């Protein structure tokens, strides 16, 4: 849904999406061939589903067709120091894909902005909408517009027939954060069909026991998960499916 959005925020006002109480499957993203770039700076570009993370932040904005590789830790430049800045320690992935056919219009649409210059470099994971007038020392800028001081935000000129370097490109950067809070967004769990009346190693929601499974007459309470014996030995489980 967030990839199929109708409106995309500017780089200086990149939208952040926080995901919780949800199971995220990356198989569709991996198998989607519409992405022109899937370089990931995380621990593994395939074990993302297997890994368990507490929370995920998605940053989506539109930049030039070029400098897509420029969105990375370090890599000093205009976009790095005066636009959305990626921290030097980043464990997420960078996804880029072309969207010329829908977001590009004739006449050079100016709905997309970007920050040209500020007093200091932008800290990682920062959003700036103040758009205060930049000063160049002399500061003769008590009026709306003065010398050496103008609007720091510049409007992108995007054209479908323009060179691919100047063509609209979509980048979505996802960040994985580890905190003291318990994990709430991890990959789907694969479950096989149960087999009964056979000594089979089983993993019932982390129980990890071995034995023979057979139907039972005991009445588990609805909230209960797995029973126990006098000697605290697991002797009954409730099937989650």
């Amino acid at each position, epitope marked *: 849904e967030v990839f199929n959005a109708t409106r995309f925020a500017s780089v200086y006002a990149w939208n952040r999406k926080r995901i919780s109480n949800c199971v995220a499957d990356y198989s569709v993203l991996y198998n989607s061939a519409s992405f*022109s770039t899937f370089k990931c700076y995380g621990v593994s570009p395939t074990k993302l589903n297997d890994l368990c993370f507490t929370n995920v932040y998605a940053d989506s904005f539109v930049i*030039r*067709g*070029d*400098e*897509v*590789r*420029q969105i990375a830790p370090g890599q*000093t*430049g*205009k*976009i*790095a120091d005066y636009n959305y800045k990626l921290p030097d320690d980043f464990t997420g992935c960078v996804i880029a894909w072309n969207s010329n056919n829908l977001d590009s219009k004739v006449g050079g649409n100016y709905n997309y902005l*970007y920050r*040209l*210059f500020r007093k200091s470099n932008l800290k990682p994971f920062e959003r700036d909408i103040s758009t205060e007038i930049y000063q160049a020392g002399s500061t003769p800028c008590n009026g709306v517009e003065g010398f050496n001081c103008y609007f720091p935000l*510049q409007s992108y*000129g995007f*054209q479908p*027939t*323009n*060179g*691919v*370097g*100047y063509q609209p*490109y979509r980048v979505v950067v996802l960040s994985f954060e580890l905190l003291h809070a318990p994990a709430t967004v991890c990959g789907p769990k694969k479950s096989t069909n149960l087999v009964k009346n056979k000594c089979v190693n089983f993993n019932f929601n982390g129980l990890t026991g071995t034995g023979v499974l057979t139907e039972s007459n005991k009445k588990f309470l609805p909230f209960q998960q797995f029973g126990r014996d006098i000697a605290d030995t697991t002797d009954a489980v409730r099937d989650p499916q």
Partner: antibody, heavy 118, light 111 residues
Framework: QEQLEESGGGLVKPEGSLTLTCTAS?????????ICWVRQAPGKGLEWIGC???????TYYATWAKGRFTISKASSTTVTLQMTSLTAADTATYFC???????????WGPGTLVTVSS | DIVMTQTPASVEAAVGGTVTINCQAS??????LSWYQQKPGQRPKLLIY???TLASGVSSRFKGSRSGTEYTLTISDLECADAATYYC?????????????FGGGTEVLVK
């Protein structure tokens, strides 16, 4: 209006390093894919070599001169310049031209003259 | 690197006339092509935005046809000012890597 200007030494020793200054009346701070590596041979013709983006990515050199030529854009007041090494019978004239949309060169700069011989 | 060729630079006309010049490349991409005016002893000028357009401040006779893999440009009504060599520039189409291949060009001679 927007205009590109160049300045450089008239003479250089053979296989000597010479710095080519370039200034632009327009700021061109973030969206200028300008090229000053187009090599105009005297009476023969131009030959593009490399470009530069404002993002400090160094872009590409096309392996025309391999790595002996480099771009170090100082930014500031539209200050851009290039270093040359192992220059041997290189052509005198080359212009700092700005690149607009559709991968073109809208505005070129004044000619420059360099002599490889001592 | 992008390899390219072009027609011989010899162009001869007596009074005006229409002369066609073909400047093509084997791997040149579509819709990304621009020519220029190279006045001897003068600054080069742009005349076309892309794919045989007019740009701004250019005579309506500076047209062309994209056609197939070959790229042909048509120039008519040659004059003393128009008696300057023209250069065709081609560029690659890729974000990761791009390069330009300047042509040998054709020289306009007016009798």
């Amino acid at each position: 209006q927007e205009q590109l200007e160049e300045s450089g030494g008239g003479l250089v020793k053979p296989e000597g390093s010479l710095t080519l200054t370039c200034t632009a009346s327009g700021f061109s701070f973030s969206s200028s894919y300008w090229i000053c590596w187009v090599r105009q041979a005297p009476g023969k013709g131009l030959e593009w070599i490399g470009c530069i983006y404002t993002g400090d990515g160094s872009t590409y050199y096309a392996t025309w001169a391999k790595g002996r030529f480099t771009i170090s854009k100082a930014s500031s007041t539209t200050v851009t310049l290039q270093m040359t090494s192992l220059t041997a019978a290189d052509t005198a004239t080359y212009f700092c031209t700005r690149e607009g949309g559709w991968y073109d060169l809208n505005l070129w700069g004044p000619g420059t003259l360099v002599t490889v011989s001592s | 690197d992008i390899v390219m060729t072009q027609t011989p630079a010899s162009v001869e006309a007596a009074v005006g006339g229409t002369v066609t010049i073909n400047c093509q490349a084997s791997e040149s991409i579509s819709n990304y092509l621009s020519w220029y005016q190279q006045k001897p002893g003068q600054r080069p000028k742009l005349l076309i935005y892309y794919a045989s357009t007019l740009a701004s401040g250019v005579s309506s006779r500076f047209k062309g046809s994209r056609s197939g893999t070959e790229y042909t440009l048509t120039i008519s009504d040659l004059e003393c000012a128009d008696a300057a060599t023209y250069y065709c520039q081609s560029a690659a189409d890729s974000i990761s890597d791009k390069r330009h291949a300047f042509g040998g060009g054709t020289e306009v001679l007016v009798k």
